[PDB]
Amino acid sequence: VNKTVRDLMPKTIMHLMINNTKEFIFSELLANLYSCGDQNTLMEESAE
Amino acid sequence: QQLTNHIRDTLPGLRNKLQSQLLSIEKEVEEYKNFRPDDPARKTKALLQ
């Protein structure tokens, strides 16, 4: 039993928590940011 | 009535296939339902992607 738990836990997390996050960053993050209103305020440059 | 009562306890299989197809389309048709011939925001984000 111990071997199986040690084996499946890493694999579970990579599938559900890390790879779903990478796919989010590459595929959707751009659309989520653009879809916010007032892109002018969103992209104001620092005074510096 | 005899035919209707013959497909019961079979429908679950049809429901799973119909639900599976809807899941692979629904993620895409959201753009189509609100499609407009004039949408500079839709065009801009499509360009960036």
Swiss-Prot record, chain B:
<comment type="function">
    <text>Catalyzes the hydrolysis of GTP and utilizes this energy to mediate vesicle scission and participates in many forms of endocytosis, such as clathrin-mediated endocytosis or synaptic vesicle endocytosis as well as rapid endocytosis (RE). Associates to the membrane, through lipid binding, and self-assembles into rings and stacks of interconnected rings through oligomerization to form a helical polymer around the vesicle membrane leading to constriction of invaginated coated pits around their necks.</text>
</comment>
<protein>
    <recommendedName>
        <fullName>Dynamin-1</fullName>
    </recommendedName>
</protein>
<comment type="similarity">
    <text>Belongs to the TRAFAC class dynamin-like GTPase superfamily. Dynamin/Fzo/YdjA family.</text>
</comment>
<feature type="modified residue" description="Phosphoserine">
    <location>
        <position position="24"/>
    </location>
</feature>
<comment type="subunit">
    <text>Homodimer; homodimerization is mediated by the dynamin-type G domain which promotes assembly-stimulated GTPase activity. Homo-tetramer formed from two dimers in the absence of lipid. Oligomerizes into a helical polymer that self-assembles around the vesicle membrane, when associated to the menbrane through lipid binding.</text>
</comment>
